[PDB]
Symmetry: C3
Subunit: 127 residues, 3 copies
């Protein structure tokens, strides 16, 4: 249960002094994921739907490397640069979480995100 | 395993989220905005009225989970106007009077769901 | 079971909040802004001085709680200018040298308490 690191080449390499996720006392604390394609290191196109899809795939990669799944996510925070993009984010986020007990959640409009991203999603999960 | 909290005394979750999730003895509440649960609409565009509603909604979630506000360990206050901090704080202080005050973070954001002026997220012991 | 952390070497908790709460083996720290506890006033608008003051304040909380920065699992960095990310990162990296870096999220918010450039919230094992 002591603090352990999660590292996978299937999620973006850390672009700063942080770990992709930390497991501790049965909780996986994921870094906020932005819409970087892990294979190229580039932000995907300036399109909220494509970016939401990329973020959720990056989160999934972190969960898999930790040996857990999206069904175990307890709580998320959505940081978006335009509150009017909430519905398009929700429409895809729901697809990802369909059939699970939906996590608790907060959504707020931020003024800017790393690399000019439109959305960043942070999750905590059970291990 | 995680378990859901659902009560008609708190605003219906529209987006693909649960009002709160309990896991390993901790209640993770969704951020509450100043919705009247009976209508789904925000209350008046007044920071004091909205803060009061948020806290009522939080109370309803805690009660359904079988816990209380004195078990809250940490909150985050998201407000659209940092100049409203004093008014939010005084109502928040009255809500927590007589308890060990939670840890807290406060930030100003440029917008909130439904055009709310305030959104408060809490974590509690169950 | 929840317990308060209080130290005169972090900014006085004016009003309804605790500097940090410990519960079930986790330290939930309040977000720290660059108030100098020696003066009670905010540090000048130099992102490096403010980031160092924030980390000094976090250090004081960890010390009083009987834990260390090696046990931090997650931080959130709220900044008023995303262009300050690099300067914050370099200081934050020196701070965490020799530890497994925490999980993290960094976002630019519309404003912070007292007009601060940076607020950092941490979660740690006790
Ligand atoms: Ca859909
Ligand atoms: Ca200790
Ligand atoms: Ca900016």
């Amino acid at each position: 249960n002591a603090k352990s690191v999660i590292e996978t080449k299937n999620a973006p390499s850390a672009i700063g002094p942080y770990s992709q996720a930390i497991c501790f006392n049965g909780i996986l604390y994921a870094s906020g994921q932005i819409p970087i394609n892990p294979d190229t290191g580039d932000l995907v196109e300036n399109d909220i739907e494509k970016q939401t899809r990329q973020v959720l795939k990056n989160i999934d990669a972190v969960l898999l490397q930790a040996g857990t799944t999206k069904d175990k996510i307890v709580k998320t925070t959505i940081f978006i640069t335009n509150i009017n993009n909430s519905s398009q984010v929700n429409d895809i986020y729901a697809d990802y979480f369909k059939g699970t007990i939906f996590p608790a959640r907060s959504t707020v409009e931020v003024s800017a995100l790393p690399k000019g991203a439109l959305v960043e999603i942070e999750v905590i999960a059970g291990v």
